[PDB]
């Protein structure tokens, strides 16, 4: 499989780069806490995409290593803060930073990550350009995260999350939110591959579009799982209207059913019977199959952009992996 | 007509405008109030004033130093947003903190936003790649100083890392290292960045940095003296505040620990480690500090850095306003008011 193969090919050099940028100026008694997040594993799909994109358009991958490190560091920076925000105890089967070291320690670590990202930016072939792209993409992620949280129906005490809670969450709102929270960084992973080794603006734009559509399809599929399992109803227990199946259901359910699903989502604690009841409501408008169809739409869009990129065989394999093409179709 | 009020009048409108411009790039209407809050709660803006006064001293112009002035003040506020989360601070500048008004998690989204606004400002400076590196270094310095400050505490934290990595001993050298990072570096940067914005003179840039660093260290030491002995005049400022907050990273405490005998050293540390430090514990701790004259030694240490700041400042042309700001920053009048006491 393509991910194992590129991990065996690129993995050691990616990991070296991550530790390298993080270690600059890093005090010895802070080293364990700072490196923890990049030592807990993870798929590294994003840096592999960046390196495969560079290899595709130029036949070289090493010049894109700084970009690959930036994208994976941005990913982990967002995870560290998201774990604090969501009070996540476990990720990749291991304790989170906030869990192992503390919420406040995790904040000092997230601060360190962003400056390690800047060191990496300065080590790219086009520092001023990557500096701008990084600011834009991290603002997209932050805004996506804000919307994801404001799309919850309950569960937060922050005066801001309570007061600014969105009254209604449409399918268009859902798609805008995932494009920012998940799409933008995958789009960046692909585009930065290209920018690292080429000045062809049209190839960089096509890589971006490709990565954006792949990232949207990826999130949609993730949402279907996070409703229908490999537990069951994770996103329902977390009160999320910003989930593809829920969003789709809300756009079809009748008045009574809609009100009731929202009621269930807004419950301070969601129990088994509530999850089964909510899912039944989803299935009653075929929300699962419609969400699956929306994923296929973005997969097909990603394919159209990918066609503009030369030597794209490996990226095509990565795409199938990312959008979990095999599993979705099986379903 | 004090220098801070004078410079607020001259620079303030443009500074405030710059802060808002960089924060507002890409900012969603429903997030706007939460993000601009930290810069609308006021603040003395000493750092950007220093930046703009340094640029003006060396070149006669301050406007080209606006992006850098925005950077330094954004970093200042960025660090404040997270420090308030970390310390669970309810109030600052007499208003609710960001975390207080909007929530701890909302404040994280705000801090994340502040750092990208800083990067927008970096890219708007005259030497974007030079400024981008300096910003990375100064923020790491601040994060490191903040880390040490916390690990130099004696109790009061529930993070496993803050408890298990807490330092066994805190010397006066550790203390100075920590405050140079936590407080000195950003004031060093403020002055250096003013010069960088308008001059390629590397020797002038280095003098400004060294000047700002010494000034920042002197300022922190005087602040430490106050956060032990209290402000005689300012209302309801508690005696022994840094004692109640379990700080060994306070100039008076570190001086004391370096001189006190073992019995006395042990007792001071027992007191700092109390979960809740009683009024009577404070009085006993202060007596321990006074027993080795730790207060006057801290004030002497502040004089040393003030004097170092002046030596560096003498290398900078047209430095009259910077001299006034130095006197403000290190609270010269107050520190000399205390030593004309005895
Ligand atoms: C927004 C989102 C789905 C984050 C998880 O990404 P991932 O599946 O790439 O996680 P990991 O880094 O653990 O592979
Ligand atoms: C951008 C980012 C870090 C998203 C994580 O979102 P989440 O909390 O919905 O996902 P997870 O369940 O992986 O924490
Ligand atoms: C870390 C540190 C020494 C902060 C000083 O705050 P300040 O006196 O500059 O506060 P403000 O920004 O409110 O004027
Ligand atoms: C770098 C930074 C923002 C330090 C804050 O210092 P502190 O928590 O010791 O005091 P305060 O919260 O009053 O600034
Ligand atoms: Mg999460
Ligand atoms: Mg989340
Ligand atoms: Mg999910
Ligand atoms: Mg504080
Ligand atoms: Mg603090
Ligand atoms: Mg103090």
TrEMBL record, chain B:
Its cofactor is Mg(2+). Mg(2+) 2 binds at residues 223, 227. Coiled coil: none annotated. Keywords: Magnesium, Metal-binding, Transferase. The keyword Metal-binding applies. One of its GO terms (molecular function) is geranylgeranyl diphosphate synthase activity. Mg(2+) 1 binds at residues 83, 87, 146. One of its GO terms (biological process) is geranylgeranyl diphosphate biosynthetic process. Belongs to the FPP/GGPP synthase family. This is Polyprenyl synthetase.
């Amino acid at each position: 499989d393509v991910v194992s193969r590129l991990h065996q090919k690129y993995g050691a050099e990616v990991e070296k780069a991550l530790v390298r940028y993080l270690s600059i100026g890093l005090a010895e008694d802070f080293r364990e806490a700072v490196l923890y997040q990049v030592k807990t594993g993870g798929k590294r799909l994003r840096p592999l995409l960046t390196l495969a994109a560079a290899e595709a358009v130029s036949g070289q991958w090493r010049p894109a290593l700084p970009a690959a490190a930036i994208v994976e560091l941005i990913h982990n920076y967002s995870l560290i803060y998201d774990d604090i925000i969501d009070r996540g105890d476990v990720r990749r089967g291991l304790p989170t930073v906030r869990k192992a070291f503390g919420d406040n320690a995790a904040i000092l670590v997230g601060i360190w990550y962003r400056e390690a990202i800047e060191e990496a930016v300065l080590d790219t072939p086009k520092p001023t350009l990557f500096a701008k792209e990084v600011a834009e993409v991290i603002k997209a992620i932050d805004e996506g995260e804000r919307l994801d949280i404001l799309f919850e129906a309950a569960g937060r005490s922050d005066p801001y999350f309570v007061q600014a809670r969105w009254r209604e969450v449409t399918l268009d709102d859902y798609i805008k939110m995932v494009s920012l929270k998940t799409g933008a960084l995958i789009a960046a992973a692909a585009k930065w591959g290209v920018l690292s080794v080429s000045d062809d603006r049209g190839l960089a734009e096509a890589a971006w579009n490709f990565g954006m559509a792949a990232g949207v399809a990826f999130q949609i599929i993730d949402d279907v799982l996070d409703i229908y399992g490999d537990e069951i109803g994770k996103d329902i227990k977390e009160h999320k209207r910003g989930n593809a199946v829920v969003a789709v259901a809300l756009s079809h359910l009748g008045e009574g059913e809609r009100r009731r699903l929202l009621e269930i989502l807004a419950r301070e604690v969601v129990e088994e019977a509530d999850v089964r009841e909510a899912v039944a409501l989803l299935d009653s408008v075929g929300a699962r199959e419609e969400a699956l169809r929306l994923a296929a739409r973005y997969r097909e869009e990603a394919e159209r952009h990918l066609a503009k990129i030369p030597n794209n065989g490996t990226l095509k394999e990565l795409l199938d992996f990312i959008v979990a093409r095999e599993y979705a179709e099986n379903l």
